[model samples]
Target chain A: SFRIAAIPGDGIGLEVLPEGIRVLEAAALKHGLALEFDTFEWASCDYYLQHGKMMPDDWAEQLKQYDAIYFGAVGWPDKVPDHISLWGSLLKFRREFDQYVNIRPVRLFPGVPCALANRKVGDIDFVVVRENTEGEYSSLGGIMFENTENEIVIQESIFTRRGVDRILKYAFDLAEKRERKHVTSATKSNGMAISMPYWDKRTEAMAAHYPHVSWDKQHIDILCARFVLQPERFDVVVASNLFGDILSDLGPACAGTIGIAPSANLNPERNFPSLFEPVHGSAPDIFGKNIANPIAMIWSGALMLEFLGQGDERYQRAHDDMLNAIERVIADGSVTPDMGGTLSTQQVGAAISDTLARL
Target chain B: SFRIAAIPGDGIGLEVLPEGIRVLEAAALKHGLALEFDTFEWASCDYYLQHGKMMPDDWAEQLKQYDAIYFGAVGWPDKVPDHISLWGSLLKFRREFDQYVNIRPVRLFPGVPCALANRKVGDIDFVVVRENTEGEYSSLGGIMFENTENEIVIQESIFTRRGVDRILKYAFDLAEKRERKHVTSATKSNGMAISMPYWDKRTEAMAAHYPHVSWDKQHIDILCARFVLQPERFDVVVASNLFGDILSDLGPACAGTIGIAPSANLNPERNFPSLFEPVHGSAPDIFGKNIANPIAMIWSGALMLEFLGQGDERYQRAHDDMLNAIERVIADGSVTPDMGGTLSTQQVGAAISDTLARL
Candidate 1:
């Protein structure tokens, strides 16, 4: 039996999580997987407004018992600032759980209108592994000579051997599993002489360990260009915190899958519960309207199952079934309005659930 | 008379520069523009091997006498390291000349096969204003606890008020001159909390200066995605050095003009000679084939004319005529291997020159 902590934080989060759970339940029943979920309402801006905090004092302790945390979007900047709502809850989970590898798969599904010309469904399929915890996002350094002509602010990008190697390994392992067996490292070593070259060096060190996996690197500038010009060429891309964050979003955008893209904040060791969430954040504009797309949420559920079943083939089969069902439904155009379908969030979820039942 | 220093750096640079000069000369003659050219044999890998450096000892002092520098390409990494070659020449030119703004216009021209689906000639057109001098390309910070498990490497991204403010101002002013009269600031303030927010604050402060221009901001991540998904909705996109470099390349890729894109490094103050070059680098693979596309080089020459013509309508007309000739040639498919044409670089140049003469 598995215990999952479900946090449908705010806006469309509240609307999509139930549909995701409904599909998850259907998948669990069909595959005979033992799964249990405990829902939380405190990890949100609404909770912050009432209690003056994004989560309880012992939120980590409460979530530690679960095998995984299934998250749905967070924040409603109109009510509370995004930094406050995000840094308070989701950022806390990432840091505390040691979910250092942020992974997202980019795929062009059938019936989805791709941004690139003449691209077929399978033309652009790849996974981006981002170093979630460190790199350019660090709050180190400060302004010197503030409020003056000589004023300068320095922001430090931190990269440790430990941090770099793990993310590179994750991407390599992922590439080994994929048919292409290729990995692309995003680096701006040409311009960013100091840190990016170090990243390239670490990538070289890691590449030596996996000789069977063919790999190459591109400066982050040209890399983004290639993301649009030649999306078919990438299989698994690994990047530093800032580069990875950029590529994951850009990759999905190229595939026309940003609306239904799922992300996994992974603690690959399984020592701490990892987090799974959708790329589409809280859509406060359409909240409580039942018009929000739930496919990303359901896709997040599929990723959660896949993560949960990592070591076992039986669970892997279950995860695959859920993904296949979701893909079939998407190709069939049984999706929410965001994806050009008229189905409500629940209706889309029901369709996937029904497909799972049949499978 | 305007003295132009033409330096065809290496490989295809040698092949395409002649054609570019031919087109420039044709336009100059047609408009009765007083233009004088002095050719240089240095600033290339071949020169590096002969002289033990990429440029002469008094390269800057010599090049300073000219009104503008017409550069083809630089570097041959197989013979000499890119850093050594680039820093010795192109990078040095940028710094010494104080060419602080790197500008590239992204436009979907007729007959160009754009990567983005359904985008017409006018659908995707924008200019990217990149802070060329300083930002993330700093050598600040260092390695700590080296050669150990706890070893950490920190690289600093330095942003100064002067550096950030000027680029923002340039972008806004450029947008004011454009048809849309809008500027989009590319930032990752939500992630890179320190420097990026400072960038945003400076942008906001700059926006206050340009009340007539409409503007908005997007994180560098989603902004890249939008480049492919919604290329039409941008007019002037401004970014930091790194972000700008990425966007400049990605913008051209979306319009399917990566092969023939031109870039200009401008001082804006006109204290020193500005530099114009094609985005296609010293392509070693297709060097000396005479099949290298001349459009980018010819286009870069056009940009040089435009930059020189900045207050004079006569020079602007010469620039426009050169551009029109090149465009007509491209739409007519009188080009090279890269653009699916049978004409050699000189043949295409001749075609453009003939068209210029007719005009």
Candidate 2:
């Protein structure tokens, strides 16, 4: 049994979110699982206008009971600035819940056109595991001689043993469960003298605990290249916040899954709710068109089920089954017009749900 | 008239150096330009073994007379570590001559199989300009609490006005000479709070000076994706040392030019000398094979002519003539086995040289 909070944040987020809900509800019913979803209207531009903020004061207090937070896209620069909406809603949850790991699955779907040459569906399947909340994104440095020829600026990239070790462990654990059982740690030890070497040391240390998992490390530059050149070689790629952000985006772009990619921010300890969302943004221009693609949202729901199935095999089955349905539907062209189908968002969602039923 | 020092370091470098030399010599003779080459045997692993060093003590003084260093690969780890061989010869030249910019041409060749899907010969062609001197790869900052749970490592990414502005100017100047006249500055301002914002501001500051050169900046994450997804939109891409390294490598990977890519480390001021070399290394495995691809070597020689032609139209014509020959040869399948052609390395080099004479 799981308690999930549905936070459909704004624009096309509102348009495509219900389809995710509909598909997930069908999945839960078919799997004979107990899943309760509570809807929230707080984290949106409309709510920001009404209340002068993105979320309620008691947002954390309200969300603490849920096992997972299923989110849609956030940020509408026209209504409320992206910085304001993002920091107030998404950033707060990530920090407060200590969701230290961000994972995004990079898989080339059968019907999807790949950006790389000669890559089949299963050929380029992998996951990008990122150390969220810290590393390279630190605010701990300043300018020395400003606005002059002698002007110099330095930024301190901080890598703690806790942050580095935990992310590596999570990636290795993930690799141990995968078919290849390999973890490729993204590093720039040669160029990035201190932090990356520390990150590399932590990778080797974490690797000791998972003897069965074979692992290697690649410099961030080459890793990004390989994401386009030889993506089939990766199983689980682990990177620091900045490197991960680059690889996660590049990986999905190479797989041609950018339009339908999903992201997960997890508190691996699960002491607090994890968050799953589509990699896409709220399409403000197409907000009410009802033609917005729901596949990313629906796929994110499948990821949520997989996350909830941590030790629970039944939810894993539900996750796998939903994914199979998604694959079959895409193969049959039962998608929205974006993926070359006449179906609306709701209809495509229904198609996936119906396919799940048949499966 | 130009004095060039030729350093055919080791392995396949011995094989390809002659080809680059042959092609360049033909181009120079055809264009009625005076060129002299002095061979050096002091920068190879064999040289290290013979004299216990990678180069002679007066290597810089000896090469200072030359306009450029036409180099082949410089490492054979089985004999001497890459660190030692590279640092001794190629790297020594870069630092001593103050070669502050590293440039690589990324172009989809007419005959080469593109790594990306649906991309043709003219679709992707761009140059990656890297700040070779400073930023990110610094020896500043260290650990506060070592080996403990509280242990944290900090790396200070240093940026200077001289470093950032110079590279941006080089890129903009490069764009101003091109048809599109657009410069894309790679940045990571959002995640990398201090260094990158400063980098972004420098980009803005430099953009102000180049009114003729239309410019925009992309965060490194999305920028890398665009290299694969939509490469046609770029002309000149300038980046910091690290971002440039990543993009330069990734750009070539996307174009499927990794096998035949060429590199240039330039002292733009030309107070001393610049270095031109293939992007590849001393392949010990294929050293005497005579089947190694000579296109990268020949391309590097073309780049040398372009560099010497800096303000001279004759040298530019020589460079252009050599490249046309190279392109025509590749189109006609006058290539080595590596590029799926039946010709030997020497045969391909002869083919390119003969074509250069006609051009």
Candidate 3:
């Protein structure tokens, strides 16, 4: 049995986490897998207000024994400041747990309207593998010649061999298993001479290990243009923190799935439990309204199934079943008002669970 | 009278430049403007072969007297390496001329089928102002612990107050004249702490100076996505070197003008001669063919008029007339086979000129 620490964060997170678990439980039963949930309430804005902290001092220590983290969105600026809630929980987990790679599925479904024209399902089905630990988002920068005509600010993008290599390896390994077996490395070597060249060099070195995978590297600028121009051509794309962040968001926006995108933060090596969560954060406005869409949360559960069952056919079956159920639920218009359906959040969640149980 | 140094740099550049000039001449006559073209034979692969350099020691000296440089694409890999041709000529002009602002009109024309779905001509019209000289492309970085597991590479993105402010000013200045009068400053302060925060601070500072130009700042990732999602909402977008590079291309691709986009590199202060060129490089495959497209070149000429005629009604009329003429030609299908029309480069050129003369 895989242990999942369910941290239903704040706002709509409390509303949607039950729906996510409902679908996950259905998926687990049908797919012949065992999923044990350990609910945690400390990683919420409510906890911050009541206890003066987002989580306990031994939060990581308490959660360390779990096989994975099933997280709902965090942050309620009204109850607790966003920085305090975010930096206190999600950011802390990412840094302390070393979730080195962040993955998001950029696939369009039948009911969703794409930002790009004439794109249907299966047209833009690629995963963005973003380095979570380091690269452009570094804090190793300072201001110089302050408040003068010669004022300058230097921001350093640090790329270590381990950080660069592991993400590339994760992407390549992921791509090799994909039918297309292709990986597109996003780099700006021609522009940023030092770090990107090193990224390319590491990519080339990593490519040698996966002979079956055909890979090419593009400068991030042109690569991004092509993302809009020819998104279907990509199977797997990997980049450092900044570039990956851009691609991950742009990829979903292109597919018209940005609002309902699922993200998986993987330690990959399994030294620590990975985290699965929806890209849509806790919606504070609709918290008590029961109108929150549960698709992203449900999709996040599907990704968790896939990750937990890697190298196992049954887990793959679990993911396929859960995903198809999502498509079915959306296609049949069994969705919340956000997606132009009359169904409530509970009704939509039950529909997905019912669809999965049968599928 | 405005003097244009006409440098048709190699390949299809040699084929289409005359057509651009042909239209320029027509616009000058109809719009009641005096224009002179000084045809230069240098800044080409042929020139590189003859002199073993893309330009002479006095290339800048020879060209500085002109009001603008009408450049065709340069570089022939068969004769001279791209880096040598690019650095020796184009890069020299940008740095030497202090053409800190690179602008590309991301406006879709009726004749071109968009890469996007259902986007009409005016649905996506905006200008991308890129900081050409600095940020992210800096050389102030190095590799330490080379060839080891502990190997690390640090790339420094250096931003100066002058560099950041001037580009923002250029964008704000451009937007104030437009109908929308809105500027979107692209930044990534949430991630990259130092440079981007500085960018946002400077952007806020600059927005105060241009009270008429209402503006907002978006992180580069979401900003690029908006270039595809809600492109019409943007009037003028100002970004640092890397983000602008992505937006400029993505903007044109969204507008279906990437293949026929025109670029203008400007000093804005008019301290040195600015350069106007087609975004399409000297495509060698179609170089000798008479069927090469001249629309981009002609479009570049229109931009040159607008730049030279800034703050003058007649110059604005000249630009509008030239642009409308080009649109008329495209609507009439008087375009090269590259744009899916059968007309030769000269025929399209003559058609645009004739159309402009009639207008």
Candidate 4:
């Protein structure tokens, strides 16, 4: 049996987790996979205010004992600093565990309303491979000089050759696994002449090593425009953390609610433990309302199964079954209100489960 | 009399300049202003290649001889290296001559067909002020060990305190003059931790200095999305050069086609010269076909007159009249095919002139 860490932290996290856990358990039973989840309900904003920390230090090391961690959501707005809530848990796990890759897949399911006028439904599904470790997210910045009237700063963006090469390789490797046998590199060489060009030159040269794959580069600004105007054009896009942060949000927002996107932070080299979470943040407005969407958390749970259930055939089957069940629910208009459907979070989860049982 | 240097550089430069210049000339005539334009035909790509340079060796100094420079367009796809051709002439003039402010006003005139899904005609009117020098265009890249096994290159991003502060101040100043009385600073601070934060922190401090104006910051990526998805939200937008380049195109594309957007590059100190030109590149594909939209070029001429017509009330009034005439033609549904009307390029110019004559 594989033990997984589950931190359904704060707001909708509380409302959504039971449903997500139920789906995960159902998928596990169907797959005949033996799995145990050690749950913690204390990783919330209330915990941080009481202890000056969101999670115990020992909790992190203990997490390593598990194969993977499943997170619902984090943050409570004014209650705690967002960076502390997010970074303290997820980003902390990622950085400490060296989980440098953040993978977000944007796909349009049937019955989901389309945003782009005149574009066919289900015409969007692409992966945004975000460089999670570096570039701007270094969180290293401040004033260098203050003259009462003004100040100066030096926020350095360091991009090593090794760093650029590895990301490009990952993007290309992923492209080989997708429908678009092409990898797109997004950077504004025309703007960020230094780091971006450094990014461009690397991706360009790296392409030579992978002759079987086709690649093209779009300036970051144009890529954003295209992603919104016509997202169907993209396949596997690799961008620095800054562009990725916006693109990931914008891309998912194109298909459905901003609250329903799932992301996985993985350290492929096993240098750190991998973590999975929903793309949406903690919504204090809907906290304890039982209305926040649980699809993202449910999806994150599926990702955890795929990660922790590593070599089990049934686990793989469970993952596919969960995804198919969600698609069916969406197709049948059983989604939460955030997605334009009138069902409550629990009802949506039950709908998916009912669909999964039949599957 | 102020001597404005005019460089109607290539192809449509020849087609559009005559009409645009005629409009300026008419405005000067009506205002009774002794404004003379020193036409420099030698600045063309042909002359550039013949002389082995885009501008004369004494060009920067020559610009000091004029109050401003009225430009049409500069580029020849096959005639020269785009970098050398553009950077040597226009970019050089801006950088060396210190034309640190690039201003572009976007508007969808009545009867003008724009790409925005739900915009009413003539509802889009906003200015995009791009920091012409330093941010991203800071010239900090170079290739190293080319064609060698251990070849490595590094491009540095130099964002000084003085540069960021000055641009923000200029942007705030412009916002004060606009109808919206609001300025939006676009930055990817979350991504480019150093320069962008440098931009943001400066913006925060600068906000205190502009108590009369409403100011806010929007991420460059989201700004682009909003510009296309809904352009009604902007009034005065300040962005870095690279972001400006992309937005300038996207803005006009939202207006309709890229053919009708104009821009002005200014050195507020007037130490060297200010410049005006259309946004589209020299479309070699449509060159000499006499089908190029001359509206942006003519509007560029209007910009030139507004900047250098010596504060002459008559010239200023006439410039206003010429703009009014263009607007009337657009409102009358007497526009070029690109704008959804059947008027030819020459016919559109004739139509504006006819309206001018009637006015």
Q: Top model by DockQ, which number?
A: 1
Per candidate, chain B TM-score? 0.94, 0.89, 0.89, 0.94
Candidate 4 is graded, for docking, as acceptable
Per-candidate TM vs. native? 0.95, 0.88, 0.88, 0.81
B156-224: candidate 1 lDDT, tens digit per residue:
888999888888989998888877899999987666767877887789889998878999988788788
Q: Which digits, one per residue and each the tens of the lDDT, describe model 2 over residues A57-120?
A: 9999999988999999787766775546776788778778999999888888888778899888
lDDT of each: 0.86, 0.84, 0.84, 0.75
Per-candidate DockQ values are 0.67, 0.53, 0.53, 0.27
True contacts preserved, each candidate?
0.75, 0.72, 0.70, 0.23
lDDT of 4 by residue, A1-359 (tens): 87778888888877888898889888877778777888886568888999998888787678888777788777775677555576666667766877778888888777877544455665678999988876645555455565544445445455666556777888899888776688888876544545665677688788887777789887665565566556788889898766777677777766756656888888888655688888766767777667888888888878777776667778778888999999898888888877788889999889988888888
Docking class of 2: medium
Candidate number of the best lDDT: 1
Worst 10 residues of 4 chain B by lDDT: B149-158
Q: Can you give the lDDT of residue B73 in candidate 3?
A: 87
Clashing pairs in 1: none
Question: How much lDDT does candidate 4 score?
Answer: 0.75
lDDT digits (tens) for residues B145-178 of candidate 4: 5555444544444556676777788888888877
Q: Candidate 1 or 4, higher lDDT?
A: 1
lDDT of 2 by residue, B1-359 (tens): 78999999889999999989888888877878889999998788888999999998988788998889999988776677554566677767876798988998888888877789989978898998988877876556889879678998878888889888888888888999999999998887645667877887788888898789899887787788789888999999998878887887788888875557888999988898999988777767677779888888888888888878868898899888888888899899887765668999999999989888876
Instruction: List candidate 1 stretches off by more than 4 Å.
Output: A48-53, A79-85, A284-290, A311-314, B47-53, B145-148
Runs in model 3 deviating more than 4 A are A8-16, A39-59, A74-92, A147-150, A208-211, A280-292, A310-314, A336-346, B7-16, B29-33, B38-59, B74-92, B209-213, B280-293, B310-313, B336-347
Error of 1 at A21 (Å): 1.5
Clashing pairs in 4: A97-A272, A155-B194, B31-B314, B31-B315
